[PDB]
Amino acid sequence: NDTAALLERIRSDWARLNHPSAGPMLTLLLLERLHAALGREIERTYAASGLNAAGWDLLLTLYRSAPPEGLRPTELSALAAISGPSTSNRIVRLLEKGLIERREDERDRRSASIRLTPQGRALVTHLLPAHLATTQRVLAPLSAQEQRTLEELAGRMLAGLEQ
Amino acid sequence: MDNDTAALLERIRSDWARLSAGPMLTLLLLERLHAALGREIERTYAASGLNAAGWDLLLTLYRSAPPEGLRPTELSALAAISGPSTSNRIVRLLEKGLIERREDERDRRSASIRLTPQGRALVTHLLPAHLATTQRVLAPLSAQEQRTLEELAGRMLAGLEQ
Ligand SMILES: O=c1[nH]c(=O)c2[nH]c(=O)[nH]c2[nH]1
Ligand SMILES: O=c1[nH]c(=O)c2[nH]c(=O)[nH]c2[nH]1
């Protein structure tokens, strides 16, 4: 009843219908199922804090990439790992939570630089050990060499889509 | 390119080093690949008003349902997407006229679901572009490399499902 069993079934079903390869469809189904399973695991680190993936990405980005003065929105967006429609209003949402700050009482207020508040920094510091343990855990089935091979293969696919 | 994911992941790597980030970076790559794949794949059915959940259901019926259709438990089990995004997709596809119910004559609560002629026509029309697109996004990898990707991804997923 696991994904491997389902994928052999789906492969068998396509072969029956096609007797037009289902090969690529099945490879991407595996990657899609893996993405979903990873997300259910990774998000447990920050779920009890009220953060979604978009919010955690922003906080981590400030934590690892912001200089002391903070990051203005264009730079912050470029250094964040998630881009797209799911990022809508994540700055507003994290401001209302009190986890990030910026001086709204100045001109160019929309471009004002953003920083972690003491609470935001404390939250990231609190949660990061479980994130590091979890990201390591979900890759543990693979050896060092296998993780490197995986990154290279996945990287070449992504390069093809971005070129 | 200094603005693609490879360049971003190198910056993130160096930033953590200045502050192991290895595992985080591997999963970031997989996450960004998932997003990019979605943006390509969904263009096949976007103009028909279907979302990923709907396309999954229609395709599941196409390849896996017998002529009499699939009852909901079996249909959910043979579909590739499970979880919160599949909420109400049967309802939505019924309202669209792409699937229909074959009601049980004794227990009207139970009924098998199948493609309508319109649903079947839609899948047939769109499937060539789906096959071309899924082949295209994998074309950077050789056949052997695609098998290797599957072995490695499969072992990771098995670890999460065991
Ligand atoms: O430096 C990061 N590490 C992550 O694990 C991660 N996840 C995410 O969404 N953004 C980031 N950024
Ligand atoms: O047999 C399938 N092929 C796919 O490419 C696909 N995509 C999806 O969501 N479900 C399915 N099912």
Q: Which residue of B has its CA nearest to A34?
A: B157
Length, in residues, of chain A: 163
d(CA B65, CA A53) in angstroms, rounded, equals 36
CA-wise closest residue to A102 among A125, A56, A77, A71 = A71
Beta strands in A21-111 (DSSP E): 100-101
For A126, counting Cβ atoms within 10 Å of its Cβ (0-12 exposed, 13-18 middle, 19+ buried), the class is: exposed
> Which residue puts its alpha carbon closest to atom 2 of ligand 1?
A60
User: Which residues of chain A make contact with B5, given a CB cutoff of 8 A?
Assistant: 155, 158-159, 162
Q: How do strand A115-116 and strand B99-103 relate by DSSP bridges?
A: unpaired
d(CA B33, CA B137) in angstroms, rounded, equals 10
Chain breaks in chain A (C to N over 2.5 A) after: 19
Asked whether the beta carbons of B7 and B28 are under 8 A apart, the reply is no
> Which residue puts its alpha carbon closest to atom 10 of ligand 2?
B56
DSSP A4: H
DSSP B46: G
Which of B57, B59, B63, B126 should be mutated for ligand 2, with most atoms under 8 A from CB?
Answer: B59
Within 13 Å, how many C-alpha atoms sit on residue A114's CB side? 25
Asked whether the beta carbons of B80 and A33 are under 8 A apart, the reply is yes
d(CA B33, CA B8) in angstroms, rounded, equals 13
d(CA B2, CA B44) in angstroms, rounded, equals 30
Give B156 Cα–ligand 1 centroid separation in angstroms. 19
List CB contacts of B133: < 8 A, sequence separation 6 or more: B40, B41, B43, B44
Of A37, A142, A155, the CB nearest to B155: A142
Indicate the helix (H) or strand (E) that contains B99.
strand B99-103
- Provide the resolution (angstroms): 2.0
Experimental technique of record: X-ray
User: Which residues of chain B make contact with A28, given a CB cutoff of 8 A?
Assistant: 37, 41, 134, 137-138
Backbone angles phi, psi at B88, to 5 degrees: 70, 10
Q: How many CB atoms lie within 10 A of CB A99?
A: 24
Q: A101: distance to nearest CA of chain B, Å?
A: 21
Q: Which residue has the tokens 């007797």?
A: A19
List CB contacts of B84: < 8 A, sequence separation 6 or more: none
Give me the residues paired with residue B41 across strands. Answer: none
Q: Which of B26, B51, B74, B147 to mutate to test the interface with A (most CBs of A within 10 A)?
A: B26
For A55, counting Cβ atoms within 10 Å of its Cβ (0-12 exposed, 13-18 middle, 19+ buried), the class is: buried
